[PDB]
Design a protein around this motif. Structure first.
Motif, PDB file in Angstrom:
ATOM      1  N   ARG A  21      43.528  -0.900  24.385  1.00 41.09           N
ATOM      2  CA  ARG A  21      42.123  -1.281  24.634  1.00 41.09           C
ATOM      3  C   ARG A  21      41.969  -2.787  24.785  1.00 41.09           C
ATOM      4  NH1 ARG A  21      42.517   3.202  26.143  1.00 41.09           N
ATOM      5  NH2 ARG A  21      41.470   5.006  25.179  1.00 41.09           N
ATOM      6  N   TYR A  23      43.640  -5.223  23.246  1.00 45.22           N
ATOM      7  CA  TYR A  23      43.954  -6.042  22.072  1.00 45.22           C
ATOM      8  C   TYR A  23      45.445  -6.257  21.965  1.00 45.22           C
ATOM      9  CZ  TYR A  23      39.099  -5.370  20.710  1.00 45.22           C
ATOM     10  OH  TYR A  23      37.725  -5.397  20.662  1.00 45.22           O
ATOM     11  N   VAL A  99      39.184   2.035  17.543  1.00 47.62           N
ATOM     12  CA  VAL A  99      39.022   0.892  18.433  1.00 47.62           C
ATOM     13  C   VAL A  99      38.480   1.290  19.799  1.00 47.62           C
ATOM     14  CG1 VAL A  99      41.335   0.855  19.500  1.00 47.62           C
ATOM     15  CG2 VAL A  99      40.157  -1.262  19.103  1.00 47.62           C
ATOM     16  N   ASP A 101      35.905   3.319  20.176  1.00 51.29           N
ATOM     17  CA  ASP A 101      34.592   3.947  19.942  1.00 51.29           C
ATOM     18  C   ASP A 101      33.373   3.104  20.296  1.00 51.29           C
ATOM     19  OD1 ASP A 101      33.917   2.164  17.913  1.00 51.29           O
ATOM     20  OD2 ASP A 101      33.860   3.688  16.334  1.00 51.29           O
ATOM     21  N   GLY A 102      33.588   1.888  20.787  1.00 51.30           N
ATOM     22  CA  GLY A 102      32.502   1.097  21.362  1.00 51.30           C
ATOM     23  C   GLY A 102      32.432  -0.326  20.834  1.00 51.30           C
ATOM     24  N   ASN A 103      32.637  -0.526  19.524  1.00 49.72           N
ATOM     25  CA  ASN A 103      32.661  -1.888  18.956  1.00 49.72           C
ATOM     26  C   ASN A 103      34.049  -2.501  18.898  1.00 49.72           C
ATOM     27  OD1 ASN A 103      29.889  -2.763  16.816  1.00 49.72           O
ATOM     28  ND2 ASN A 103      29.861  -1.735  18.764  1.00 49.72           N
ATOM     29  N   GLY A 104      35.051  -1.790  19.400  1.00 51.41           N
ATOM     30  CA  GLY A 104      36.392  -2.365  19.501  1.00 51.41           C
ATOM     31  C   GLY A 104      36.913  -2.721  18.110  1.00 51.41           C
ATOM     32  N   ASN A 106      35.905  -5.027  16.190  1.00 55.28           N
ATOM     33  CA  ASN A 106      34.852  -5.488  15.274  1.00 55.28           C
ATOM     34  C   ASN A 106      34.574  -4.499  14.144  1.00 55.28           C
ATOM     35  OD1 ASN A 106      33.849  -8.101  16.599  1.00 55.28           O
ATOM     36  ND2 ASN A 106      33.706  -6.581  18.283  1.00 55.28           N
ATOM     37  N   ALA A 107      35.042  -3.257  14.306  1.00 53.13           N
ATOM     38  CA  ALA A 107      35.094  -2.271  13.243  1.00 53.13           C
ATOM     39  C   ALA A 107      35.721  -2.788  11.949  1.00 53.13           C
ATOM     40  CB  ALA A 107      35.910  -1.098  13.745  1.00 53.13           C
ATOM     41  N   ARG A 112      37.258  -9.313  12.350  1.00 54.71           N
ATOM     42  CA  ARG A 112      36.110 -10.088  12.813  1.00 54.71           C
ATOM     43  C   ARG A 112      36.079 -11.464  12.136  1.00 54.71           C
ATOM     44  NH1 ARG A 112      32.539  -6.359  11.164  1.00 54.71           N
ATOM     45  NH2 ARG A 112      31.637  -7.761   9.600  1.00 54.71           N
ATOM     46  N   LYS A 116      39.531 -12.778  14.813  1.00 57.52           N
ATOM     47  CA  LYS A 116      38.800 -12.945  16.054  1.00 57.52           C
ATOM     48  C   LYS A 116      38.572 -14.419  16.387  1.00 57.52           C
ATOM     49  CE  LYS A 116      34.590 -11.328  18.328  1.00 57.52           C
ATOM     50  NZ  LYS A 116      33.323 -10.559  18.105  1.00 57.52           N
TER      51      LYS A 116
END
Length: 129
Positions: A21, A23, A99, A101-104, A106-107, A112, A116
């Motif tokens: 994804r 990363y 990862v 599921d939409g927030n990558g 940041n889960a 984060r 990040k």
């Protein structure tokens, strides 16, 4: 099992996490460092009564069944204890679902707040990959 840094990088790469994804591998290694200190047996209770398990501190509120997190889902369809094994397959497979599921990434709070926007490539520097 307490993985070595390069040892974990190699296992993560073998299981398909490098650029998963988008990363890069260093993101995953960095996340594991600050989530678990590379310890597959790490567990940490959350204030809501859920618990985080394993190398990537996957949360029983949504992702695994620990039998003591009311109303929770088990989206990875596994006992949370499977996330504590020396074999990281279950953790990696579940992390892939998370990862995606939409927030990558940041889960993962530690990703984060600690990985990040940093030089995450340092986490794989020297490793034979």
């Amino acid at each position: 099992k307490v993985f070595g840094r390069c040892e974990l990088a190699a296992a993560m790469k073998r299981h398909g996490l490098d650029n998963y994804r988008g990363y890069s591998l260093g993101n995953w290694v960095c996340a594991a460092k600050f989530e678990s200190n590379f310890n597959t047996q790490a567990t940490n209770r959350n204030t809501d009564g859920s618990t985080d398990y394993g190398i990537l501190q996957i949360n029983s509120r949504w992702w695994c069944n620990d039998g003591r997190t009311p109303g929770s889902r088990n989206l990875c369809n596994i006992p949370c204890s499977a996330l504590l094994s020396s074999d990281i397959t279950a953790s990696v497979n579940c992390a892939k679902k998370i990862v995606s599921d939409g927030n990558g990434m940041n889960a993962w709070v530690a990703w984060r707040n600690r990985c990040k926007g940093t030089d995450v490539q340092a986490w794989i520097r020297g490793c034979r990959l």
